[PDB]
């Protein structure tokens, strides 16, 4: 709806915003989303992971 400048959320985390120059809505997503796991065989064993 009009008269809106920010996009809120249930957790009060911004996700959308209106560009004041192009008058169109954008989207915000954190640079890191997924989870990363690393498997190692031990320090003495080797260093490859």
């Amino acid at each position: 709806q009009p008269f809106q400048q920010f996009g809120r959320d249930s957790s009060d985390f911004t996700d959308s915003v209106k560009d004041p120059k192009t008058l169109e809505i954008l989207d915000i997503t954190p640079c890191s989303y997924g989870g990363v796991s690393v498997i190692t065989p031990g320090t003495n064993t080797s260093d490859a992971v």
Binding site: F13, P30, C31, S32, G35
Partner: protein, 49 residues
């Protein structure tokens, strides 16, 4: 002086349910707290372990 003795039998099948396990979860502090903020990350590091 009396006694009761059964003369017939029946076969019955019953069910029983027992939980064995639940879901597994993980939590990241640097993302749940101080989401995308270098100053807040430094403050959290200063806070302690």
């Amino acid at each position: 002086n009396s006694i009761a003795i059964p003369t017939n039998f029946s076969i019955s099948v019953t069910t029983e349910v027992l939980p064995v396990s639940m879901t597994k979860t993980s939590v990241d502090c640097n993302m749940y707290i101080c989401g995308d903020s270098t100053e807040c990350s430094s403050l959290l590091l200063q806070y302690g372990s």
